Structure formats: structure tokens, C-alpha cells
Amino acid sequence: EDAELLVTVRGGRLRGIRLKTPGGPVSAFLGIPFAEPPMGPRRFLPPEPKQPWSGVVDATTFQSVCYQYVDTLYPGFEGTEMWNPNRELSEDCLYLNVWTPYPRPTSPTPVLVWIYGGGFYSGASSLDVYDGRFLVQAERTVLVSMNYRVGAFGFLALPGSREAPGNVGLLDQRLALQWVQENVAAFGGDPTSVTLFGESAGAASVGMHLLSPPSRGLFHRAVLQSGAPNGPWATVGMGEARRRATQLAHLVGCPGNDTELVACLRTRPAQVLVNHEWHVLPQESVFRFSFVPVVDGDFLSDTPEALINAGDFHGLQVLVGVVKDEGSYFLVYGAPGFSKDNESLISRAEFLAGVRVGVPQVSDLAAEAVVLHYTDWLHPEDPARLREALSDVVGDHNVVCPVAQLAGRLAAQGARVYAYVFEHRASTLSWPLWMGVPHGYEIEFIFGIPLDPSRNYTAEEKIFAQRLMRYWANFARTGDPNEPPQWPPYTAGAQQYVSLDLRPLEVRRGLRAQACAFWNRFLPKLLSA
Amino acid sequence: REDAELLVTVRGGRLRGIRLKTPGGPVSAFLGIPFAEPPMGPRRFLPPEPKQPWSGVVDATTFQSVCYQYVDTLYPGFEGTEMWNPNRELSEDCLYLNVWTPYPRPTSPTPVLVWIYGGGFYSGASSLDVYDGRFLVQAERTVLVSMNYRVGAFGFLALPGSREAPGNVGLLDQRLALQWVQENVAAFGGDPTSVTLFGESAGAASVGMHLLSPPSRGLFHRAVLQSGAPNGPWATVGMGEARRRATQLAHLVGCPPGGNDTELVACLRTRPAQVLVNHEWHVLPQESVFRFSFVPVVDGDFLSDTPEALINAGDFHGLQVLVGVVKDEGSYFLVYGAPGFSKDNESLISRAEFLAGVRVGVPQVSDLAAEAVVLHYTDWLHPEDPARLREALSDVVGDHNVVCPVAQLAGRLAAQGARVYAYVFEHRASTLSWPLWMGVPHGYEIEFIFGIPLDPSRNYTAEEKIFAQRLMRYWANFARTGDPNEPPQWPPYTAGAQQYVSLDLRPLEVRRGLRAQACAFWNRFLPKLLSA
Numbered sequence A: 001e002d003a004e005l006l007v008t009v010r011g012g013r014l015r016g017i018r019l020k021t022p023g024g025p026v027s028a029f030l031g032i033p034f035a036e037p038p039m040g041p042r043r044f045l046p047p048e049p050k051q052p053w054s055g056v057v058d059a060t061t062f063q064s065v066c067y068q069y070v071d072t073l074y075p076g077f078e079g080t081e082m083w084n085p086n087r088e089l090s091e092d093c094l095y096l097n098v099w100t101p102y103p104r105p106t107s108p109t110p111v112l113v114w115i116y117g118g119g120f121y122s123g124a125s126s127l128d129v130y131d132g133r134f135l136v137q138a139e140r141t142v143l144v145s146m147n148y149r150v151g152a153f154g155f156l157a158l159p160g161s162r163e164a165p166g167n168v169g170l171l172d173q174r175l176a177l178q179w180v181q182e183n184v185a186a187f188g189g190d191p192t193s194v195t196l197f198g199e200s201a202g203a204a205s206v207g208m209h210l211l212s213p214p215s216r217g218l219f220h221r222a223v224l225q226s227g228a229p230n231g232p233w234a235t236v237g238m239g240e241a242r243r244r245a246t247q248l249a250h251l252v253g254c255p256g257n258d259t260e261l262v263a264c265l266r267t268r269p270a271q272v273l274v275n276h277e278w279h280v281l282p283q284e285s286v287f288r289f290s291f292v293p294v295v296d297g298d299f300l301s302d303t304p305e306a307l308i309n310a311g312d313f314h315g316l317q318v319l320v321g322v323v324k325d326e327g328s329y330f331l332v333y334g335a336p337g338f339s340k341d342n343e344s345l346i347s348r349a350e351f352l353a354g355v356r357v358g359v360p361q362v363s364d365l366a367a368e369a370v371v372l373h374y375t376d377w378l379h380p381e382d383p384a385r386l387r388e389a390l391s392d393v394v395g396d397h398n399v400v401c402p403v404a405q406l407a408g409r410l411a412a413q414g415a416r417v418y419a420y421v422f423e424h425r426a427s428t429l430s431w432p433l434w435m436g437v438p439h440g441y442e443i444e445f446i447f448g449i450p451l452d453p454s455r456n457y458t459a460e461e462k463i464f465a466q467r468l469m470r471y472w473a474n475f476a477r478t479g480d481p482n483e484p485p486q487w488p489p490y491t492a493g494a495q496q497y498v499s500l501d502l503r504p505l506e507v508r509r510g511l512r513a514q515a516c517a518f519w520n521r522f523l524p525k526l527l528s529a
Numbered sequence B: 001r002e003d004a005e006l007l008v009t010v011r012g013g014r015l016r017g018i019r020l021k022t023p024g025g026p027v028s029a030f031l032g033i034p035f036a037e038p039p040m041g042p043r044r045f046l047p048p049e050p051k052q053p054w055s056g057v058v059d060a061t062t063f064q065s066v067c068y069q070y071v072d073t074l075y076p077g078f079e080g081t082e083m084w085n086p087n088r089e090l091s092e093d094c095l096y097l098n099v100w101t102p103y104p105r106p107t108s109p110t111p112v113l114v115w116i117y118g119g120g121f122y123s124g125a126s127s128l129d130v131y132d133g134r135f136l137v138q139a140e141r142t143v144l145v146s147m148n149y150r151v152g153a154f155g156f157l158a159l160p161g162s163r164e165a166p167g168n169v170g171l172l173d174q175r176l177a178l179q180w181v182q183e184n185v186a187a188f189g190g191d192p193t194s195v196t197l198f199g200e201s202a203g204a205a206s207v208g209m210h211l212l213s214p215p216s217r218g219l220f221h222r223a224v225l226q227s228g229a230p231n232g233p234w235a236t237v238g239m240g241e242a243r244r245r246a247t248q249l250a251h252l253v254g255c256p257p258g259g260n261d262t263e264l265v266a267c268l269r270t271r272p273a274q275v276l277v278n279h280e281w282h283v284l285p286q287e288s289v290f291r292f293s294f295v296p297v298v299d300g301d302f303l304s305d306t307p308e309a310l311i312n313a314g315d316f317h318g319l320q321v322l323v324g325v326v327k328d329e330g331s332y333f334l335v336y337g338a339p340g341f342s343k344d345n346e347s348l349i350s351r352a353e354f355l356a357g358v359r360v361g362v363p364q365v366s367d368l369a370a371e372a373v374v375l376h377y378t379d380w381l382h383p384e385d386p387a388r389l390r391e392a393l394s395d396v397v398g399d400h401n402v403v404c405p406v407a408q409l410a411g412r413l414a415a416q417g418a419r420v421y422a423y424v425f426e427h428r429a430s431t432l433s434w435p436l437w438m439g440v441p442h443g444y445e446i447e448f449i450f451g452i453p454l455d456p457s458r459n460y461t462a463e464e465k466i467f468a469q470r471l472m473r474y475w476a477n478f479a480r481t482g483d484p485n486e487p488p489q490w491p492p493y494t495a496g497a498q499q500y501v502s503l504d505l506r507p508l509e510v511r512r513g514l515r516a517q518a519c520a521f522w523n524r525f526l527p528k529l530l531s532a
């Protein structure tokens, strides 16, 4: 009966499991309840702290995945199934996981806290690609990851109402961060050295905790991978949030009091809400999600973009970056002429049609400005160039330029910023070659998944993964990824970043500076007049 | 006695010319042929009336007066500016034309080249040294004609709808000269069935307007547009703005002491010509470069619609045109008002001066339009580099006013049935007096087209004399056949391939795109922005 796997937290006693890695054992505590189950009357409500328990909670296996849409675009395809739930769906899903070295550390060790992505409509801390055992063994850190409510269950908002205030999925994350502050020392973690990191909507979540004062005291450093809180998909206004919530109620046979409305929604099975989730969007689109954080003055006192411009970020260190081809993944989900199973050599007409889908809810004039900038007017109809251009449109608008704006504003306002572009295409990648390095496929290297012997990564890849784990952990420990070729900080003027691939670090200038000047500087002025 | 080669009878009466010496042999020149009644006194602002017949022999032996115009004083005594200033006395009695013909007179009908000078519709003269037609005629055996036309208020002041000052009379001066060519050029040996118009800057815009005006279209067969287009943002003005500028000029000179148009023009006609010139520039609505007070007006008569509309909607089958630009169209105009610019220093401007220059180089556009210009012409990896900013503002002014209007005209004509040839002139003359940073400025291909390097009193290199002879051959080949190529090839310009040739001391090099990325902004996007 192993004392290393027995831990007492404030709520009671836990029993963990000893996990094997190629580098030696790891202690894991999986499925720790940090909130009361948000069931029945608690649906749509802020999380409530988990009440204490007697006896020993079995923390030896992942708990349920929060209720979410399950992707069916390519059934059985590894490229999509790796993101789908690998545990049963349940609204009883507010659990977190702790990985720690074996034996448990006696002195405080820096803590890494992972927030998964998935467009605020999906995701789980139990996915194979988020396995924390390799990072913990290799870099001697404590790693924490939590489940948080997604879709309507986490972000349906009737603003001003108590029954459905919105942003409760963000409050799930905050409660887990508060849990870390109060309990991580029992596992050997240092609550005074907590580094948030997340990808896609998880990166947008990290940025929103940066911009919400009640969350700012719960961590010390931040890593934003391929996502930003100022992304055009990451927040929604109060009026549009109310419209989407009201439209969902109509679609599921629900009725006008906000109270009556939510009460009827609470009688519906969770799967029924999921089945109508995508139908409340105003337009046919890619890279848009129905229920996302709402700007209502509470969690976010203003839009993330306003909060970024007006903040004093002295004393903050951030690590941000993007993959080489942020836009390609999303094109197969609705852009005309695109598929993972052919070359997606689109025509000019399909390109123009894709622009309206990839840049939804903008005026015709705004769309024409997009076409002007992303057309090569010496080769206006070349299919290969059009395919690459539409990928750039979607990737720049939704990921690269929001990340570039956040990096530049934080750096100019006192933060130390390190920026990267991930440019290695995994030898095991199942997506076609034309997609390049797609969104989300740096994660497996950050987590050291290539070190798993049962996988088919090359020897060079394993060394690459170990390099990236060292950068990320160096940043967690010191706020500086460099090993004491150097990685210089990103600044609004020099705009320096490094490329991450099998070659040594290469310093370059500009995160798509010409393109992002369009999205970040001109287009806001066009839309306002 | 008399040299029969220098005696010609036209419809108005008899003329006596002069024999000119050229390095290649003699040429007959008839300079100062009256083609209209002098538009003086009551005839000021009125359409030209044909010159009434005369008895005896008119001596057409020297250039006549320059039409009344502003005289540039930016760099007094400087060759780069003085070469464009009048070289004859100013007078409203200025409606004369010139004919150069080979000596002896041609035996069979010879193709005719007709030159229309530029000068922003406010200046210019057919008598400038750089327009000397003796070298083209001797080298290529063509007949060359050039005319004076009224400029400034005298040629383009418009009170639209008014009978006393209808506007566009300077264009009617050009048309009357073209009608004179049809009726009389055969007496000099010229072929009235093979007439090629060519002009530069506002002369090129004038050529394009004759292409788009049916009464002029029957008077010529081919066109050459050098560094100018009728669809340039400076080349035409609306009816209301023309009336506002004309009314403001009258107000500035004490007329009336608006109101009745007849009375208004009658008061203007009592003012000395120099008094009108002295107030010409004060009627512009905004501080700017590349904008001129009195230009052709779109009033439904000479131009039934805007040139852009007429170009987009026209059928141009059976037409051959040659168009082109110099390498640095914008640089010349920057020293005339862009902050931080001068011919006497490097003009390495700051970011603030660049932003200020954009409003001067793109006048009368909304703040949003100006922001679009700044977005496009800023290198956001080097947003404050002075050298890059200087080059960028030159591109802004050159693309907006010359390159992109020419590219739009070239693309639409080619797509709608015309045979188009396009060039970029990239040779900086060894004799150029402008600073090195200005590159190949606007207007400095003309001396090579006219073969000026062949003048023995000039100091051009031997390569430049060979170069000049190449260009004269291209232009005359086009005049004779509609194809500059010899009976390295010059391919036609098309809306898709967008092929043009570089003209310099090296052989022809074929390239693609007349600043396609930049001109997509000016020609395709910016119009949509201004309408919303």
C-alpha cells in the first residue's frame, strides 16, 4: 500500500496511481473532484466548491468528459478522432488531474496548468495528446489539467439573469486555479510559481484569465499557443449571446421570463442541447462557435481588445506562438472545394465563396478588401495559390493576427514576450501534405508524446520534443525559455520570433506583419465607417 | 527667287516655309501656320473658329507665340524646370500649328504623326526645344504635325451650360487642328488615312479624350499615350466643381462687381490675360500636388460620360494603341509641395512627413481612404525608414495619377478589342539635371522619342544616340503599321498576361504587370470604398 500515492487535500483523502514512462515512474492523481456536479438545478450556474468527503476518493483513472458535440466529418480518421471524447459524456465532469514526479517532491516545484482547446464547444483533459507523464518526468514539474464545461453548458448566457449568467466554463477554470492555490502543495507543487498554458480556445482562456483581475492572482506566467482572447471567435456581445440562447430554447421546444426560459432548458436532456448547438449561428461559417465567453462587464469588464490596449503589463512574461498553417485544418469543415482526400485545388469562384465563409458577418466592402489583399493580381486564378491564400485568410484573421496584436501590445506595455512559429510536420501526421503544419499539431511535441516507444516518431523527433519541453519548462521556472543560439524577446518594433523545427533556432522578423496590419489596423476603421 | 519645296497651298491660301538642317540632311518645316481665328477679346473662352482664307503668301518660318500661361519659378534658371517654360512671348493669339516634312517633298502619301504637348492643361507649347520634329522626320521619313492649344482658364474655364464659356475649348483647338490635318496634310505629302496621335502627360490624356469622343475619332487611326490617361484623377472635373472654380476666379478678379453667366464672362473678358493667370492657382479646393485648376469638364458634350465609364463600356476593335510610363512617375511632382522634399537634398522624409504627403498627393479623399493608402504603401517591418518612405510616397503619387490610370486604360482597351503595346522607360539620361534620387522622372523619355540626342550641339553619349534611333523606329513602326516590331520581339499587352517591355540601353526585356498589386488597389478596391 504505497504512501507516495496517498494524498490528503482540503476536501479529504485521495489515492493515485504510479505510471510508467521511458524515463522512469510518475505519480498521477486523475479525476479529482474540485466542484459539486453541475447537474439539474445547477446547470448553467457558476461552479460550487466540492464539499468535503469521508473515506478515500479513487483518483486512478480519468473521469467523464463534459457533454459536447462529437465530430463525424471523417469517422475513424486519426486526424479527427484524436480530438473526440475518449471517456463517457456527462454533466458530472468537473474533475482535474495532477501529475507529479515519483517519489512525490519534498520541496516546492514549479506548477504547469493546462487548459485544453476545442472552440469552447469541445475538449477534455483525458485526451492522449495531453498526457502529462512525459513533461513531469523529463522536466521535474507538477502538471495540473482540469475539465471545464463547454458548449451551452459552459457558455449559454442570458446576460443580467441569475439563472444563466454566462462564462461559467471560465469560472470552472478559475475554481480549478483556486484549487491549485489551496491544494497543490500537498503534491509537492509550488503555488507561488504557477504557469498557465493552453492551445486554441485554451489559449484564449489563458488570455482571459490574464485580463480578469480575480484570476490574475492565481498564476504568475502564461503561455498562449495558437489562440488569443481578442480573436474574432473567442467572445460574443451581450445582445448576440441573448439571441443565440433564445434561439436554442426555440429549437428544443422551450418558450417571457429568463427564469421560465432557463427552467425549461433545464428539463431537456444534455444531448438534446448538443444536437441543436450549431444551428444558432447567424451565418454559414468556419471558425465560429455558438456559445463562447460573453463580454458583460463582469468576468470581462470590457472587450479583450480594449483591455489589452489599456493594461499595464510590467512584470508579466508570456510565451506565444502559432503553427505554420493555422488556417488549413478549418477549411475542410465548410470551405467550398476543400477536402482532406484531394488536393483542394480550388477555383477563383470557390475562393471568393470561401472568403465569405471564412470571414463571416462582415460587409461586402470588407470582404472586397480581403480579396484585394490576398489576391496575387499577376496570378489571380491559380488554384494552388488560391488554396494557400484562403488558408492564409482564415489563419491570419482568426489566429495569427490576434496573437500578433496581443504580443505587440503586451510588449509595448511592459511585458516580456517570447514568440515562436512551429514549423515541423510530424512524420506521423495523417492529414494530407497540402495542409502543411496544421492547427493543434505542436501539442504532442510540447507534451513529449514522441517519447512514447509505442509510437512511430523518428529519433530526431524525440530530441526535438525534448528541446521543446525544456523551452516550456525553462519559461515556467524563470520566465525565459533560453538555456543559460538565443531566443530574443518579441517587441513591437523588431517583431522577432524563432522558428521551431528540427534545425536549430532561427530568428526572424514579423508575424505576418503586412497581412496583420490589414486585420489589426485598417479593417477596424473600415467596419466603423 | 523661290524654292518650290518651301511653297505649299492649303485651303486657306499659300504658305512659305523654311529648309532646316539636320545631321542626316535637310527637312522642310512650316512653323506657325494659323489654323484658327485669334481667340482674342470677344472670342476669349469661345470655341475656335476656322481661320478665314487669306491672299498672298503667309510666312510659316518660325514658331508662333505661346498661349498665355503660368510661368514656373520654383528653381529659377534651373535647366530641369526652364526646359518646360515658354520659349516665345505669351499671347492669346496663339492658335498655330507646325508641319515638318522631308526634303524633297514625299512622292507618295506618308504616315502622319501628330504631337499634343503636356503641361497639366495649364502650360506647354509646341515650340519647346524638346519637341523639335526635325529629327523624327529625317530619321523615319514621316510627316510630323504639332499644334498649340489654349491652356489654363483660356482653354478650360467652364461655366457649364453657358454659351459664352462652355469649356473644353482647348480640346476643340486640338480637334480643329486635327480637322486641318485631314483637309491639308496631303499638300505636304502626308497621308490623311494614316494619322497617329501621340502626346505625353496632359497631352496623353488629351489623346485619350479624342479616342473617347466620336467627332474626334474619325480624324485619326492610331494613338500613343505616354505617361498619361484621360481617366487620371487630375485630367477631368465635374460640372459643378468646374463652375465653382470659374466662379471663384471671377470673384477673385472682381467679377461681378456669380449671377448671370453672360455678364460674368463679359466681365472676365475685360481683365488682362496676366491678371487671370496670376489668380489661377487660388481656386483649387485643397493644398495639393498633381492637381490643376482648369481641366477638361465632363458635361455630356465632348465627353458624353466620364472617361472611366467610356473606357469600360467602349468597343475598341480595329484600334491599335501604344502606352507606357517612365520608371519614376511620382518623383518630379514631390518637390512642388510634398513636405520635406527638394531637388537640392536627399528628401529623406520622416514618417510624419510621409503621412502628410499622402494627403497632399491624394487630395480630396476621406480619412478612411487615406488610411487605406497608408496601409498599402507602408512596409510594416520598416515603417519609419526615411529612404523607403521617400520611395513609397513617390509610388503613391505616381501610381495614383499616372501608372494605374494607364494600366486600367491598357487593360480595358485590350480586353475590348484593341491591340495594345505597353512599355516602361527606364533610362536616366546622362544629361539629366535633376538629382539622382528622382530616378527617371516624368517627361524625360520625350527627348529620346524626338531624337534630340542627335543634335550636334548636345553632349549625349553615343549609346544614347543609338538608343534614340531605336525608339524613333519603334514609334514610327507603330505609326506606319500599328506594330512597333520590325517587318527581340515586343508582345502585345493583354489583361491576363499584362506583358510590357523595358526601354533602356539594354535590349528589350519582357515583363509582367504594370504595378499590378498597387493598381488593383487604385483601380478595383478604392472606387468601391468611395461609394460607401
Ligand SMILES: *[C@@H]1O[C@H](CO[C@@H]2O[C@@H](C)[C@@H](O)[C@@H](O)[C@@H]2O)[C@@H](O[C@@H]2O[C@H](CO)[C@@H](O)[C@H](O)[C@H]2NC(C)=O)[C@H](O)[C@H]1NC(C)=O
Pocket: A334, A335, A336, A337, A338, A339, A341, A342, A343, A344, A345
Ligand atoms: C475535392 O473534394 C471536394 C469534396 O467532395 C467530397 O469529397 C470528394 C473526395 C468526393 O468524394 C466528393 O464526391 C465528395 O462530395 C469536392 O467538392 C464537392 O464537389 C461536388 C461536385 O462533384 C459538389 O456537389 C459538392 O458540393 C462539393 N463539396 C464541397 C464541400 O465543395 C471537390 O470538387 C473535389 N475537387 C476535385 C474533385 O478536384
Ligand SMILES: *[C@@H]1O[C@H](CO[C@@H]2O[C@@H](C)[C@@H](O)[C@@H](O)[C@@H]2O)[C@@H](O[C@@H]2O[C@H](CO)[C@@H](O)[C@H](O)[C@H]2NC(C)=O)[C@H](O)[C@H]1NC(C)=O
Pocket: B260, B261, B262, B263
Ligand atoms: C443675362 O444677361 C444677358 C445680357 O443682358 C444684356 O446686358 C446687360 C448689360 C443689360 O444691358 C441688359 O439690358 C442686356 O439685355 C441677357 O441676354 C440678353 O437678353 C435680352 C432679352 O432676351 C436680349 O434682347 C439680348 O440680346 C441678350 N443679350 C445677349 C445675349 O448678349 C440674358 O437674358 C440674361 N439672363 C438672365 C437675366 O437670366
Ligand SMILES: *[C@@H]1O[C@H](CO[C@@H]2O[C@@H](C)[C@@H](O)[C@@H](O)[C@@H]2O)[C@@H](O[C@@H]2O[C@H](CO)[C@@H](O)[C@H](O)[C@H]2NC(C)=O)[C@H](O)[C@H]1NC(C)=O
Pocket: B337, B338, B339, B340, B341, B342, B344, B345, B346, B347, B348
Ligand atoms: C530638404 O529641403 C527642404 C526644403 O527646404 C529648402 O531647401 C533646402 C535645400 C534648404 O535650402 C532650405 O533652407 C530651404 O528652405 C527642407 O524642408 C524645409 O525646412 C524648412 C526649415 O528647415 C522649413 O521652413 C520649410 O517649410 C521646409 N519645406 C518643406 C517643403 O518641407 C528639408 O528640411 C530638407 N531636408 C533636410 C535638410 O534634411
Ligand SMILES: *[P@](=O)(/N=C(\C)N(CC)CC)OCC
Pocket: A083, A116, A117, A118, A119, A120, A123, A199, A200, A201, A202, A227, A233, A329, A439, A440
Ligand atoms: P481551437 O479550440 N482547437 C482546435 C480546433 N483543436 C483541434 C485541432 C485543438 C483542440 O480552435 C478553435 C479556436
Ligand SMILES: CCO[P@@H](=O)/N=C(\C)N(CC)CC
Pocket: B084, B117, B118, B119, B120, B121, B124, B200, B201, B202, B203, B234, B332, B442, B443
Ligand atoms: C499632368 C501633369 O503632368 P503632364 O502635364 N507634363 C508635365 C508635368 N511635363 C513637365 C515634366 C511635361 C510637359
